[PDB]
Design a protein around this nucleic acid. Structure first.
Ligand SMILES: [Mg+2]
Ligand SMILES: [Mg+2]
Ligand SMILES: [Mg+2]
Ligand SMILES: [Mg+2]
Ligand SMILES: [Mg+2]
Ligand SMILES: [Mg+2]
Ligand SMILES: [Mg+2]
Ligand SMILES: [Mg+2]
Ligand SMILES: [Mg+2]
Ligand SMILES: [Mg+2]
Ligand SMILES: [Mg+2]
Ligand SMILES: [Mg+2]
Ligand SMILES: [Mg+2]
Ligand SMILES: [Mg+2]
Ligand SMILES: [Mg+2]
Ligand SMILES: [Mg+2]
Ligand SMILES: [Mg+2]
Ligand SMILES: [Mg+2]
Ligand SMILES: [Mg+2]
Ligand SMILES: [Mg+2]
Ligand SMILES: [Mg+2]
Ligand SMILES: [Mg+2]
Ligand SMILES: [Mg+2]
Ligand SMILES: [Mg+2]
Ligand SMILES: [Mg+2]
Ligand SMILES: [Mg+2]
Ligand SMILES: [Mg+2]
Ligand SMILES: [Mg+2]
Ligand SMILES: [Mg+2]
Ligand SMILES: [Mg+2]
Ligand SMILES: [Mg+2]
Ligand SMILES: [Mg+2]
Ligand SMILES: [Mg+2]
Ligand SMILES: [Mg+2]
Ligand SMILES: [Mg+2]
Ligand SMILES: [Mg+2]
Ligand SMILES: [Mg+2]
Lengths: 260, 144, 185, 62, 67
RNA sequence: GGAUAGUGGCCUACCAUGGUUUCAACGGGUAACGGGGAAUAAGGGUUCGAUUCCGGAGAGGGAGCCUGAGAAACGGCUACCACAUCCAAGGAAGGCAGCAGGCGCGCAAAUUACCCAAUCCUAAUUCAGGGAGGUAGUGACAAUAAAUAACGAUACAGGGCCCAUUCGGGUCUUGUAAUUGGAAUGAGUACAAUGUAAAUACCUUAACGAGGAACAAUUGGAGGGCAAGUCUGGUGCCAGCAGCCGCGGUAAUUCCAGCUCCAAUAGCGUAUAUUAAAGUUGUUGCAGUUAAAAAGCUCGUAGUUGAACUUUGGGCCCGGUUGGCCG
RNA sequence: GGACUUUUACUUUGAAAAAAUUAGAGUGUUCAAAGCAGGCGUAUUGCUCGAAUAUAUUAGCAUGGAAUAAUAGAAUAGGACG
């Protein structure tokens, strides 16, 4: 196409943002950044779509150009910064913090969390590798490289980075029966223990996942994101605890809650 | 039994054999051979307008007897000469020689209608007003 | 390069266009429910067919079928909320027996007639379109409004309009002045 | 087969039919009112019959 | 009549945060009076045929006619 | 080996003779950009997709290259080819398959309008720019909702259930009106507010806005198929009608009209294509003695298709679901 | 306890799967085509459900099955197992 595309037609846009069909021709289109543009969430979406603090688009740069918002600690002013999974986003001028942790449909929950926790976040290691000058380094999913890590951490292990200082502080291995988040695929939004990793030499290992309500299911190796010991999360989980309820069951929970 | 192969592995034969046979189907072959675009006096288009060369009084087929009023038109878009029937009482006096008229099919898909021989078309407009409107005197033919 | 504001045709005309016994049957309905044209019967005719088709489909499925069960009782739930399906005809077999007037009766047309207000469907018509009616605060001026059960007992006259209170119409409020302009001064 | 026939008499009959103008008359009810009119007439009133009923039987059998 | 409205934690703080088409409805900010789009544009394009100040070039233009 | 960002006959030198094909190569045609999808509703299918999203290609035709991370870029350059503008005749300059608009083409397709308010993009950038995009104009493409009238009054007629001895007939309820009277309303026109970037329309709302020369619905049709005239006047195998069968030759149910009637109705007709009907392409699912159709005969390769048998039967454990039942 | 079909077809179940469109749940755009909204209250500085689900009929990948249909194998034993 002769080079980099810069627009985004308002339908090719990631569905989980829940933009509306009309309103205009276009969607925000993520900037280049820490997360893959289809797996991301523009700040502009968050502030005006998810948070409803803004109306215009102008009134978002309004907020952003005020440093009212910081992502993973740092002040980010880009209208369309590719904020994504495990991220924090902190609105100081209204003392609230969030965490971009998935819904159970597959969307980005407005899962508000404390000022504790906000000082850390998880990070699946994508590659761990020996850099130049004999130095080693891990590469988390969010586009962080942390040099000098524990020789114990291999790929698909998660890592508790700080947030103000880099630095890995504790880490979880990937093995039989750990608390797992699903980051994409059909089962996006789910949460549970493992049981089996089906190895397929050549490509695409598969992870059978059990939830607290005993519902086995499968995904691909990269879809899986370890987050703690069984029943013991390493972070706050949104409402519904990533369980996936059938639309039958779903019907009740709503109409039965209604009335009183 | 049946005279057609029934093997689970015979698709090719059953497939080509019908593809082979769609040809005896007229409407299909007309479509595939593009008769429409080639031999048909219109492009395949639903209408054509040409210029009126002369007026004709084609006599009817048996067992009828009348002088069906028509016109030899020469189609602008491809210079073809074909003749077209001019419907309704004395409308033939609405069209003149050299008069530029819109023709349409006779609604037979190419065949001749009724007892009017050689005529596969009809005059629908003339000097761009509508023959229908003229015959009912609600519109008037602009001067030549 | 926007996005299509999608659309749909609401009715469908019959195949054979000159059945006398259908045209008799059709004309009848037009007169007792106060209809303007055949299209108002077609629109409903069409409606029913999608219901019967949706119905007859779920029935081919084995029961206990999470789709059948979900998407069946849902249909039934909607059909009852309007008064097309009876309070204990709640079975898919029974939605299949739904005939055209079942819907036609629930017409806000035929409801301004039924519970007083009109004493004529062809009075009920002009009553509605001339905004002389309301479900609560809301003036509903569409004859094919389809009155649901809970709303049935709320179809009182308009908060404006003479027939409902506050002021008379301009033809009233003009005679009242014309009997003053001449007979007085 | 024969293509030049007489064009001389093109428009005979439309030009020698005596021009008689349509009678003035009350209007029919354009709209729902018409169908209503048609209902109450076609089978509420029910005019002349025979074993079929008849829509346009001008000057009858007698 | 359902509508939408908002209340700012000041007067002139509302003034830097409100779209200037609102402020003019109020009399708050003033109504800016500029030339029509095509008029605006046609100027830009006119101005583009010029390298330098032009304040220089109008000498070139005029030097030729005054001899 | 060269070359490329790199793989590779990508190119070169040398060496072999290999590579594809009836399981249809190669060649031809396409009124062929591919897909998402669209029309057609028993199923199976049939037909379509230039066109809102994705991918591709191209910027009059070809080739070549500068710059750059990215172009073989065309609102970049260079040449040839085809066009073609200005000229003081020496020279100079252009590329709308961007938005408008013009010509041509044809059956066939709208304003040289307003704006960055929204959606989003770009930049050194909260500001600038955006015919991206939005707004309005033209717009019976297609789709949705649905006014063109409503309720009385009375005089006959009566559905009149009767009383009942008779033009003696109760009391509502249909229908007929050159008969009547009070109500209702938005189509409009318009204060205002609302809407808007500014206007406009929508919604809301004062002042007005109904009785038939209106606020006056049309388009087809009335022999059959096929719903609805054997009424009238005109024509006389003429004019004309008729998808098809057929109507017309002086009593025309079919032409030309008046009357009335039918069907659909803010819409109806016509032409062309296409789908259903078509079990008239048949996998489901056709037909082949005589209606179209078994090669004169046999062999035979490709293709399709090909008898039967190999753990059968017995006996345990385990927790599952629809009906007995009754609260 | 983990890999395991002689080699296939077949079939079951999944995974990796854009939106719109389609099927379709919820929602009183006043109805409807739509849209993805909205719903509640002290409505004087708030509360709150959502934006599901099905889809896909080839091929590839993963998996439960072995009836049906192919196919391989010890015969001059250059047989099998330890
Ligand atoms: Mg961006
Ligand atoms: Mg000739
Ligand atoms: Mg300048
Ligand atoms: Mg190379
Ligand atoms: Mg080589
Ligand atoms: Mg050779
Ligand atoms: Mg195509
Ligand atoms: Mg082409
Ligand atoms: Mg296409
Ligand atoms: Mg195609
Ligand atoms: Mg084309
Ligand atoms: Mg290009
Ligand atoms: Mg051109
Ligand atoms: Mg550049
Ligand atoms: Mg370009
Ligand atoms: Mg180029
Ligand atoms: Mg250009
Ligand atoms: Mg143009
Ligand atoms: Mg011009
Ligand atoms: Mg024309
Ligand atoms: Mg057009
Ligand atoms: Mg803008
Ligand atoms: Mg700007
Ligand atoms: Mg400044
Ligand atoms: Mg009118
Ligand atoms: Mg009137
Ligand atoms: Mg008529
Ligand atoms: Mg009939
Ligand atoms: Mg006669
Ligand atoms: Mg006829
Ligand atoms: Mg007649
Ligand atoms: Mg046959
Ligand atoms: Mg024969
Ligand atoms: Mg023979
Ligand atoms: Mg066998
Ligand atoms: Mg993928
Ligand atoms: Mg298998």
């Amino acid at each position: 196409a002769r080079g980099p595309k810069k627009h985004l037609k308002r339908l090719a846009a990631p569905h989980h943002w829940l933009l509306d069909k009309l309103s205009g021709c276009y969607a925000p289109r993520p900037s280049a950044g820490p997360h893959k543009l289809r797996e991301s969430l523009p700040l502009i979406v968050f502030l005006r779509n998810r948070l409803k603090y803004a109306l215009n688009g102008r009134e978002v740069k309004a907020i952003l150009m005020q440093r009212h918002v910081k992502v993973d600690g740092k002040v980010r002013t880009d209208t369309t910064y590719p904020a994504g999974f495990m991220d924090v986003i902190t609105l100081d001028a209204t003392n609230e913090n969030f965490r971009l942790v998935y819904d159970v449909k597959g969307r980005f929950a407005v899962h508000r969390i404390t000022d504790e926790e906000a000082s850390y976040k998880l990070g699946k290691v994508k590659k761990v590798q020996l850099g130049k000058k004999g130095v080693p380094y891990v590469v988390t999913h969010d586009g962080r490289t942390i040099r000098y890590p524990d020789p114990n951490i291999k790929v698909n292990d998660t890592v508790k980075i700080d947030l103000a200082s880099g630095k890995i502080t504790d880490f979880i291995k990937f093995d039989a029966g750990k608390l797992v988040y699903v980051t994409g695929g059909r089962n996006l939004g789910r949460i549970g223990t493992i049981v089996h990793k089906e190895r397929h030499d050549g490509g695409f290992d598969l992870v059978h996942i059990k939830d607290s309500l005993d519902n086995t299911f499968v995904t691909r190796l990269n879809n899986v994101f370890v987050i703690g010991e069984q029943g013991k999360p390493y972070i706050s989980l949104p409402k519904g605890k990533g369980i996936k309820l059938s639309i039958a069951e779903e019907r009740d929970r709503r109409r039965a809650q209604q009335g009183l | 039994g049946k005279g057609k192969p029934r093997g689970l592995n015979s698709a090719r034969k059953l497939r080509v054999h019908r593809r082979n046979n769609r040809w005896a189907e007229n409407n299909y072959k007309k479509r595939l051979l593009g008769t429409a675009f080639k031999s048909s006096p219109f492009g395949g288009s639903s209408h054509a307008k040409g210029i009126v060369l002369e007026k004709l009084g084609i006599e009817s087929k048996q067992p009828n007897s009348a002088i069906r009023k028509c016109v030899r038109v020469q189609l602008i878009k491809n210079g073809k000469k074909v003749t077209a029937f001019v419907p309704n009482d004395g409308c033939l006096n609405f069209v003149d020689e050299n008069d530029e008229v819109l023709l349409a099919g006779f609604g037979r898909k190419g065949k001749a209608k009724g007892d009017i021989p050689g005529v596969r078309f009809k005059v629908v407009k003339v000097s761009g007003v509508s023959l229908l409107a003229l015959w009912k005197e609600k519109k008037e033919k602009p001067r030549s | 390069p926007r996005a299509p504001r999608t659309y749909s045709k609401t009715y469908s005309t019959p195949k054979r266009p000159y059945e006398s016994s259908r045209l008799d049957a059709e004309l009848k309905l037009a007169g007792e429910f106060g209809l303007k044209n055949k299209k108002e019967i077609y629109r409903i005719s069409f409606q029913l067919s999608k219901i019967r088709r949706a119905a007859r489909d779920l029935l081919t499925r084995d029961e206990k079928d999470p789709k059948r069960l979900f998407e069946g009782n849902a249909l039934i739930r909607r059909l009852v909320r309007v008064g097309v399906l009876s309070e204990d005809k709640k079975k898919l077999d029974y939605v299949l027996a739904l005939k055209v007037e079942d819907f036609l009766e629930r017409r806000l047309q035929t409801q301004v007639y039924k519970l007083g207000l009109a004493k004529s469907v062809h009075h009920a018509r002009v009553l509605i379109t001339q905004r002389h009616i309301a479900v609560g605060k809301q003036i509903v001026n569409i004859p094919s409004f389809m009155v649901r059960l809970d709303s049935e007992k709320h179809i009182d006259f308009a908060p404006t309009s003479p027939f409902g209170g506050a002021r008379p119409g301009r033809v009233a409020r003009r005679n009242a002045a014309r009997k003053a302009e001449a007979s007085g001064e | 087969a024969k293509v030049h026939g007489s064009l001389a008499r093109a428009g005979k009959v439309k030009s020698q039919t005596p021009k008689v103008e349509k009678t003035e008359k009350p209007k029919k009810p354009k709209g729902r009112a018409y169908k209503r009119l048609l209902y109450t007439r076609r089978f509420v009133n029910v005019t002349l019959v025979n074993g079929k009923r008849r829509m346009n039987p001008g000057p009858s059998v007698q | 009549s359902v509508g939408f409205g908002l209340v700012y934690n000041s007067v002139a703080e509302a003034k830097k945060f409100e779209p200037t088409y609102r402020l003019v409805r109020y009399g708050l900010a003033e109504k800016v009076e500029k030339a029509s789009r095509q008029q605006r544009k046609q100027k830009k394009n006119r101005d583009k045929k010029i390298f330098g100040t032009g304040k220089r070039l109008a000498k070139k233009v005029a030097r030729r006619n005054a001899d």
